[PDB]
């Protein structure tokens, strides 16, 4: 047998992946189902996954001239911009006048 969509293989067992916003705390078995847990308030995981640790949210230092363009959710990281100010690097880790 081969695995269906949104599944992963572990010791010839097709387990369900974890939905976004949730990390893995237990692989499935022939008879139980994969055990996921929600990310933390400041944590996120954006894909169907079998990660064991969520990712931390981008922080937007106002010292570095940053405003929060979209707040962090559990399945999306924060999105940040500059505000008046104009961004230096293309990835936009910091801004300037």
């Amino acid at each position, epitope marked *: 047998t081969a695995c269906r969509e949104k599944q992963y293989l572990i010791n010839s067992q097709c387990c369900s992946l974890c939905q*976004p*916003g949730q990390k893995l705390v237990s692989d499935c078995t022939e008879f139980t189902e994969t055990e996921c847990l929600p990310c*933390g*308030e*400041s*944590e996120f995981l*954006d894909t169907w996954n079998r990660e064991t640790h969520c990712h*931390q*949210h981008k*922080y*937007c230092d*106002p010292n570095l001239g940053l*405003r*929060v*363009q*979209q*707040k962090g*959710t*559990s*399945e*999306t990281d924060t999105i940040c911009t500059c505000e008046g100010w104009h961004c230096t690097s293309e990835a936009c880790e910091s801004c300037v006048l």
Partner: antibody
Amino acid sequence: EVQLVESGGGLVKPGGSLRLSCAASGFTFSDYGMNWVRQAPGKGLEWVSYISSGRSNIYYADTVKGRFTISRDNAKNSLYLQMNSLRAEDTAVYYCARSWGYFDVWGQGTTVTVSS
Amino acid sequence: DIVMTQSPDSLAVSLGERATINCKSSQSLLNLGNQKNYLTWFQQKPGQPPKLLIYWASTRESGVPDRFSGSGSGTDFTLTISSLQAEDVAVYYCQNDYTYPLTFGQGTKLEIKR
């Protein structure tokens, strides 16, 4: 039950300072983001500041940038607002509100009056 | 800063009838990632803090009765209280939960006609 209990309000002279406290019970304080929100007598709600649950990231409303400072003591299950140089437009009821993507539990509020 | 503007400012509705409070935001509140609209409705009875009613524009908080209903998308949303009840008298606030600073609507005072 889940509880948030604000304290430390009162009467205060303009340009003077005041430190508010909020004592949490009934939930994993360390897990939630904590917020301060105020409501001036007669007016609507104003979100004042936020402090995250992870690496304790902090955001502020511009109208208190530079004057208020938010902090938490997870060991003590306490949230704090140190308010400095209070102008009289700061007179309001200050609400303690936990968040996990929305303010689902609020305190009863404490009153702060910035008066001559 | 996003600006939440509510309409009507004041509304009187008889018991049993349907109340309609509207909210418009200056930005969109759609998170294109999880496809959720980050609008939140609160009820504030007097002497009490606001009480969360509905988040993600349509998802009802636990314990909120089915007669409370959230609808809308993008920049225009609606809180519809059908089968209005004596204890529904409060001020209702919509709230930008999309980014910082988090901004509320200005209020809608609902009266009960009796």
